[PDB]
Design a protein around this motif. Structure first.
Motif, PDB file in Angstrom:
ATOM      1  N   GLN A   1       0.264  21.966 -15.400  1.00 36.81           N
ATOM      2  CA  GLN A   1       1.627  22.330 -14.965  1.00 36.81           C
ATOM      3  C   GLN A   1       1.679  23.002 -13.586  1.00 36.81           C
ATOM      4  N   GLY A   2       2.672  22.628 -12.792  1.00 31.78           N
ATOM      5  CA  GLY A   2       2.828  23.237 -11.473  1.00 31.78           C
ATOM      6  C   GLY A   2       2.025  22.555 -10.376  1.00 31.78           C
ATOM      7  N   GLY A   3       1.019  21.768 -10.738  1.00 30.46           N
ATOM      8  CA  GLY A   3       0.276  21.029  -9.734  1.00 30.46           C
ATOM      9  C   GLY A   3       1.018  19.831  -9.194  1.00 30.46           C
ATOM     10  N   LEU A   4       0.667  19.469  -7.961  1.00 29.23           N
ATOM     11  CA  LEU A   4       1.183  18.260  -7.306  1.00 29.23           C
ATOM     12  C   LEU A   4       0.002  17.317  -7.105  1.00 29.23           C
ATOM     13  N   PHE A   5       0.046  16.180  -7.809  1.00 29.32           N
ATOM     14  CA  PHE A   5      -1.048  15.230  -7.812  1.00 29.32           C
ATOM     15  C   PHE A   5      -0.706  13.997  -6.969  1.00 29.32           C
ATOM     16  N   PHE A   6      -1.533  13.731  -5.963  1.00 32.83           N
ATOM     17  CA  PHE A   6      -1.367  12.552  -5.083  1.00 32.83           C
ATOM     18  C   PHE A   6      -2.151  11.365  -5.577  1.00 32.83           C
ATOM     19  N   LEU A   7      -1.512  10.193  -5.580  1.00 34.85           N
ATOM     20  CA  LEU A   7      -2.133   8.965  -6.079  1.00 34.85           C
ATOM     21  C   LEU A   7      -2.076   7.891  -5.010  1.00 34.85           C
ATOM     22  N   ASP A   8      -3.110   7.050  -4.960  1.00 35.40           N
ATOM     23  CA  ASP A   8      -3.203   5.915  -4.022  1.00 35.40           C
ATOM     24  C   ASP A   8      -2.876   4.658  -4.828  1.00 35.40           C
ATOM     25  N   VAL A   9      -1.985   3.833  -4.307  1.00 39.82           N
ATOM     26  CA  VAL A   9      -1.535   2.636  -5.022  1.00 39.82           C
ATOM     27  C   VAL A   9      -1.761   1.390  -4.153  1.00 39.82           C
ATOM     28  N   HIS A  10      -2.570   0.438  -4.654  1.00 42.75           N
ATOM     29  CA  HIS A  10      -2.753  -0.838  -3.978  1.00 42.75           C
ATOM     30  C   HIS A  10      -2.237  -1.954  -4.849  1.00 42.75           C
ATOM     31  N   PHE A  11      -1.110  -2.553  -4.454  1.00 42.06           N
ATOM     32  CA  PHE A  11      -0.594  -3.696  -5.195  1.00 42.06           C
ATOM     33  C   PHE A  11      -1.360  -4.952  -4.790  1.00 42.06           C
ATOM     34  N   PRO A  12      -1.701  -5.795  -5.774  1.00 43.79           N
ATOM     35  CA  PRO A  12      -2.374  -7.062  -5.489  1.00 43.79           C
ATOM     36  C   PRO A  12      -1.414  -8.097  -4.913  1.00 43.79           C
ATOM     37  N   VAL A  13      -1.974  -9.145  -4.315  1.00 39.48           N
ATOM     38  CA  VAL A  13      -1.178 -10.166  -3.655  1.00 39.48           C
ATOM     39  C   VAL A  13      -0.272 -10.935  -4.620  1.00 39.48           C
ATOM     40  N   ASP A  14      -0.671 -10.991  -5.892  1.00 34.98           N
ATOM     41  CA  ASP A  14       0.108 -11.685  -6.913  1.00 34.98           C
ATOM     42  C   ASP A  14       0.777 -10.738  -7.903  1.00 34.98           C
ATOM     43  N   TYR A  15       1.013  -9.494  -7.478  1.00 40.66           N
ATOM     44  CA  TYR A  15       1.867  -8.587  -8.244  1.00 40.66           C
ATOM     45  C   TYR A  15       3.185  -9.313  -8.530  1.00 40.66           C
ATOM     46  N   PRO A  16       3.774  -9.163  -9.746  1.00 38.19           N
ATOM     47  CA  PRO A  16       3.393  -8.278 -10.861  1.00 38.19           C
ATOM     48  C   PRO A  16       2.534  -8.956 -11.921  1.00 38.19           C
TER      49      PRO A  16
ATOM     50  N   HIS B   1       0.854  -1.190   0.000  1.00 37.94           N
ATOM     51  CA  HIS B   1       0.000   0.000   0.000  1.00 37.94           C
ATOM     52  C   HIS B   1       0.892   1.244   0.000  1.00 37.94           C
ATOM     53  N   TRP B   2       0.844   2.012  -1.090  1.00 38.60           N
ATOM     54  CA  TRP B   2       1.708   3.200  -1.270  1.00 38.60           C
ATOM     55  C   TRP B   2       0.899   4.469  -1.535  1.00 38.60           C
ATOM     56  N   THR B   3       1.515   5.606  -1.255  1.00 40.45           N
ATOM     57  CA  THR B   3       1.111   6.903  -1.841  1.00 40.45           C
ATOM     58  C   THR B   3       2.161   7.352  -2.811  1.00 40.45           C
ATOM     59  N   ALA B   4       1.743   7.868  -3.965  1.00 41.65           N
ATOM     60  CA  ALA B   4       2.705   8.412  -4.917  1.00 41.65           C
ATOM     61  C   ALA B   4       2.328   9.830  -5.293  1.00 41.65           C
ATOM     62  N   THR B   5       3.299  10.590  -5.793  1.00 38.77           N
ATOM     63  CA  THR B   5       2.972  11.882  -6.393  1.00 38.77           C
ATOM     64  C   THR B   5       3.523  12.042  -7.784  1.00 38.77           C
ATOM     65  N   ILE B   6       2.806  12.790  -8.634  1.00 37.61           N
ATOM     66  CA  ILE B   6       3.410  13.246  -9.880  1.00 37.61           C
ATOM     67  C   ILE B   6       3.205  14.749  -9.963  1.00 37.61           C
ATOM     68  N   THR B   7       4.162  15.450 -10.540  1.00 35.54           N
ATOM     69  CA  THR B   7       3.948  16.870 -10.795  1.00 35.54           C
ATOM     70  C   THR B   7       3.310  17.002 -12.148  1.00 35.54           C
ATOM     71  N   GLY B   8       2.373  17.937 -12.276  1.00 34.25           N
ATOM     72  CA  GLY B   8       1.696  18.100 -13.564  1.00 34.25           C
ATOM     73  C   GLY B   8       2.734  18.341 -14.663  1.00 34.25           C
ATOM     74  N   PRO B   9       2.539  17.744 -15.832  1.00 29.94           N
ATOM     75  CA  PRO B   9       3.521  17.915 -16.912  1.00 29.94           C
ATOM     76  C   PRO B   9       3.622  19.362 -17.392  1.00 29.94           C
ATOM     77  N   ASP B  10       4.840  19.796 -17.736  1.00 27.88           N
ATOM     78  CA  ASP B  10       5.015  21.163 -18.175  1.00 27.88           C
ATOM     79  C   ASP B  10       4.274  21.343 -19.512  1.00 27.88           C
ATOM     80  N   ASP B  11       3.909  22.580 -19.826  1.00 29.70           N
ATOM     81  CA  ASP B  11       3.192  22.839 -21.076  1.00 29.70           C
ATOM     82  C   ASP B  11       1.901  22.022 -21.162  1.00 29.70           C
TER      83      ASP B  11
ATOM     84  N   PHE C   1      -6.376   8.568  -8.376  1.00 32.31           N
ATOM     85  CA  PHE C   1      -6.021   9.895  -7.864  1.00 32.31           C
ATOM     86  C   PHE C   1      -6.693  10.178  -6.531  1.00 32.31           C
ATOM     87  N   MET C   2      -5.931  10.782  -5.616  1.00 38.91           N
ATOM     88  CA  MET C   2      -6.510  11.382  -4.401  1.00 38.91           C
ATOM     89  C   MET C   2      -6.699  12.891  -4.576  1.00 38.91           C
ATOM     90  N   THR C   3      -5.995  13.466  -5.542  1.00 43.66           N
ATOM     91  CA  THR C   3      -6.175  14.860  -5.917  1.00 43.66           C
ATOM     92  C   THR C   3      -7.297  14.982  -6.937  1.00 43.66           C
TER      93      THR C   3
END
Ligand code: CO
Length: 150
Positions: A48-63, A34-44, A71-73
């Motif tokens: 752009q300039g935004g910070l986007f929070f994402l929720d990540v749930h890996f399954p038991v049989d990943y990958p 169970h992770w949180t990730a962020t990406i910054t909005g792509p330039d152009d 998205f949480m944002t």
């Protein structure tokens, strides 16, 4: 549990050692599935300039199956809905174990630069984009300002 955990640990080392640019990610607490990730909005782009929070749930049989990534944002886009569900082929039937969370975050950043209203998850947002692209971009920019400040 075992092959999945070793793969996720490897990806976490790779985030520490060689992350995708403009991204961060890691476990919420002591559960590596169970992770949180962020990406910054792509330039152009309207994000752009935004910070986007994402929720990540890996399954038991990943990958062998995709992580669930949402998205949480709040974000205005024809392929992301009001619950942050993302319509992205590689998170569904096009998942491959060669993909990593890093590659997914890069693909989601690419998706933000390519809003396509032809096969949308949020048909009302797509209606704005198709009818008046400038209006869509203005709203997407306003939502970035309002809802995606770091
Ligand atoms: Co979560």
């Amino acid at each position: 549990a075992a092959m999945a955990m070793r793969r996720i640990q490897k990806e976490l080392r790779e985030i520490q050692q060689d992350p995708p640019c403009n991204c961060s990610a890691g476990p919420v607490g002591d559960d590596i599935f169970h992770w949180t990730a962020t990406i910054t909005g792509p330039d152009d782009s309207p994000y752009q300039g935004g910070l986007f929070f994402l929720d990540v749930h890996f399954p038991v049989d990943y990958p062998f199956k995709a992580p669930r990534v949402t998205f949480m944002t709040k974000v205005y886009h024809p392929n992301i809905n009001k619950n942050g569900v993302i319509c992205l082929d590689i998170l569904k039937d096009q998942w491959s174990p060669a993909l990593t969370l890093s590659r997914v975050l890069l693909s989601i950043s690419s998706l933000l630069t390519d809003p396509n209203p032809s096969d949308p998850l949020d048909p009302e947002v797509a209606n704005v984009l198709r009818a008046n692209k400038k209006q869509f971009e203005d709203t997407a920019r306003e939502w970035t300002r309002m809802y995606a400040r770091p």
